[model samples]
Target: ENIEVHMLNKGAEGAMVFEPAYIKANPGDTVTFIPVDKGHNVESIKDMIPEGAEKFKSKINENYVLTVTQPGAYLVKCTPHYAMGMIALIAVGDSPANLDQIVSAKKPKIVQERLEKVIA
Candidate 1:
């Protein structure tokens, strides 16, 4: 199955946010990021994906798909607006293996604050 996530300049919570900022998927599931606005591209952060997982980046202004095959955390970001704190966290499988590492990774203030609830 594929989950749709919207990339927006301004959304329900604030500007530079991904609609449904957090997602929980199982291995073999996929997530699609839609460019609802310009200047947004998806990227998987280094050290943010679990072991055996792949890193990915999308071309700006285009829709991109990511499939999860491991039980861990995937922290996605909008390359252009990353500094503005645009990010999404995807949890795959019943138990996320790299959650601790993901939560402790340094990130932009807004990104960290926004993800607190999901990671907490």
Candidate 2:
């Protein structure tokens, strides 16, 4: 299934925010972030927030898409409005397939480091 997240104007003028505030998906599923307007970028910031995510940034109005290969809770934020909490959370899969559990099980000092090890 393909999930679409629309970016909207938050409290700030011209600031972008995710509509649903959160999403859920499973492995093999594709999640697409669509911009209702321009001036927004969807980025994974797990590195900045350990409970956060670390995927590279995607372009605005570019229809960012990602396949949920690993199951877990992922956080996304808008580059232009990150200061305003322009973020969306995604939970991929259920228990046993849950990404948060898998990441929590790791003993790494920071989950981002563990992700780096796995990604690298």
lDDT score at residue 76, model 1, on the 0-100 scale: 88
Using all chains and alpha carbons, the TM-scores for the candidates as numbered come to 0.94, 0.67
Which candidate number has the best TM-score?
Answer: 1
Backbone clashes under 3 angstroms, per model: 0, 6
The total of clashing pairs for model 2 equals 6
The residue pairs that clash in candidate 2, if any, are: 46-52, 46-53, 49-52, 71-99, 72-99, 72-100
Q: Put down candidate 2 lDDT per residue, 47-79, tens digits, no spaces.
A: 432232346689876878877666666756777
> Ten consecutive residues with minimal summed lDDT in candidate 1?
111-120
Task: Give all candidate RMSDs, comma-separated.
Answer: 1.1, 8.8
Writing each residue's lDDT as its tens digit, candidate 1 over 1-120 gives 999999999998789989888999998898888989899999999989888887889999988888889888889899988888898999998778788788888998888888886566
Model 2 off-target regions past 4 Å?
Answer: 11-15, 48-54, 96-120
Instruction: Give per-residue lDDT, candidate 1, residue 72.
Output: 80
The TM-score, computed over Cα atoms with residue i paired to residue i, of candidate 1 is 0.94
Candidate 1 regions exceeding 4 Å error are: none
